[PDB]
């Protein structure tokens, strides 16, 4: 439900084929927040419970609203935490296909982390979904150093954070349908395009 630590808790000897690392939005609970559980149950239906490990970004990522105003749209301590989980995934399960996602501050966190990631690990992230991406206009709908065909951004009309502002208006809170259908669909297509482990 809102906390999932399958990568940290998982046994190396029985690695999942797919590892999903997700960063929640500002002020959200657990380490998956409001959208992460919906994506997670749909990934589990497609790959089975032992086939996918879902891991939220917890630890130093406190999802403090004010950190949206920092240069990268989140704190450097939170980037170091997500970078460390991609590194843990690469070490603990070298043949697993990775997928990532984030909402709001967590989408800026996922973008910042993937930009700084070692190229050999970044290249294992088969697909990344970003909802209410706060750096959407500044980065022109892309994650730096990561291919457009592997990226899907969900930015609602009237969601002001997609258009260069940090005001939270009602469309920013309306990604529930996307997390239940097209965002898991995109992630499953991108994993099946390359395959699993």
Active site residues: 104, 159, 172
Give the number of other Cβ atoms within 10 Å of residue 171's Cβ: 16
**Residues in contact with 66: Cβ distance below 8 Å, sequence separation at least 6, in sequence order:** none
Query: What does the radius of gyration of the chain's CA atoms come to, in whole angstroms?
Result: 15
Task: Compute the distance between CA of residue 90 and CA of residue 140 in angstroms, rounded to an integer.
Answer: 29
For the chain, helix, strand, coil in percent to 5 are 45, 15, 40
Q: Report residue 193 CA to chain centroid gap.
A: 19
What CATH number is associated with residue 101? 3.40.50.1820
Three-class DSSP category at 66: helix
Q: How many helices (H) and strands (E) does the chain have?
A: 7, 5
Cited resolution, angstroms: 1.8
Give the number of other Cβ atoms within 10 Å of residue 1's Cβ: 10
Three-class DSSP category at 120: helix
What are the backbone angles phi and psi of residue 153, rounded to the nearest 5°?
A: -110, 135
The residue segments making up the domain with residue 44 are 1-197
Task: Compute the distance between CA of residue 52 and CA of residue 93 in angstroms, rounded to an integer.
Answer: 12
5: which DSSP letter? B
For 60, the token pair is 């130093």
96: which DSSP letter? P
Task: Compute the distance between CA of residue 24 and CA of residue 36 in angstroms, rounded to an integer.
Answer: 7
Give the number of other Cβ atoms within 10 Å of residue 187's Cβ: 25
Q: How many residues does the chain have?
A: 197
Nearest to 65 by CA among 105, 107, 31: 105
Task: Compute the distance between CA of residue 19 and CA of residue 146 in angstroms, rounded to an integer.
Answer: 18
For 136, the token pair is 């959407």
For 65, the token pair is 């609203």
Three-class DSSP category at 114: helix
Task: Compute the distance between CA of residue 35 and CA of residue 109 in angstroms, rounded to an integer.
Answer: 16
Domain tally for the chain?
Answer: 1
**Residues in contact with 176: Cβ distance below 8 Å, sequence separation at least 6, in sequence order:** 34, 35, 38
**Residues in contact with 52: Cβ distance below 8 Å, sequence separation at least 6, in sequence order:** 16, 17, 18, 19, 20, 43, 44, 46
End-to-end CA distance of the chain: 26
Indicate if the alpha-carbon torsion angle 55, 20, 182, 46 is positive or negative: negative
């Amino acid at each position: 439900r809102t906390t999932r630590d399958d990568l940290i808790n998982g046994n190396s000897a029985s690695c999942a084929d797919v590892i999903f690392i997700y960063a929640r939005g500002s002020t959200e609970t657990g380490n998956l927040g409001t959208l992460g559980p919906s994506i997670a149950s749909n990934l589990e239906s497609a790959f089975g419970k032992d086939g996918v490990w879902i891991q939220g970004v917890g630890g130093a990522y406190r999802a403090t609203l004010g950190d949206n105003a920092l240069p990268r749209g989140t704190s450097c301590a939170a980037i170091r935490e997500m970078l460390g989980l991609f590194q843990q995934a690469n070490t603990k399960c070298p043949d697993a296909t990775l997928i990532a996602g984030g909402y709001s501050q967590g989408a800026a966190l996922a973008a910042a982390s993937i930009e700084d990631l070692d190229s050999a690990i970044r290249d294992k992230i088969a697909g990344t979904v970003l909802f209410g991406y706060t750096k959407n206009l500044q980065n022109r709908g892309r994650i730096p150093n990561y291919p457009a065909d592997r990226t899907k951004v969900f930015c609602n009309t009237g969601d002001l954070v997609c258009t260069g502002s940090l005001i939270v208006a009602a469309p920013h809170l309306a990604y529930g349908p996307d997390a239940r259908g097209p965002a898991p669909e995109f992630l499953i297509e991108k994993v099946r395009a390359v395959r699993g482990s």
